[PDB]
A = this chain, B = another copy of it.
Amino acid sequence: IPSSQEKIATIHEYLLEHKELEEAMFSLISQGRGRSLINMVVKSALNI
């Protein structure tokens, strides 16, 4: 049921509460490693 806006808002709140995650994601994205970030997080979530 949750919409994309609700998912984004939930992640936004999580990033604010966990600055390490925000800083690590920005570092990976801004340094051109976002594709490795996508692949790694998707694989982890699919193996729940």
What 0/1 pattern do residues 15 to 48 of A give for CB contact below 8 A with B?
1101111111111111101101110111011101
How far apart are A37's CB and chain B's nearest CB, in angstroms?
7
Size class of the contact patch on chain A: 35 or more
Q: Is the interface of A mostly helix, strand, loop or mixed?
A: helix
A14 touches B41 (CB 8 A): no
CB-defined contacts of A29 to chain B, threshold 8 Å: 10-11, 14
B24 touches A16 (CB 8 A): no
CB-defined contacts of A40 to chain B, threshold 8 Å: 40-41, 44
Interface residues of A (CB under 8 A from B): 2, 4, 7-8, 10-12, 14-16, 18-31, 33-34, 36-38, 40-42, 44-46, 48
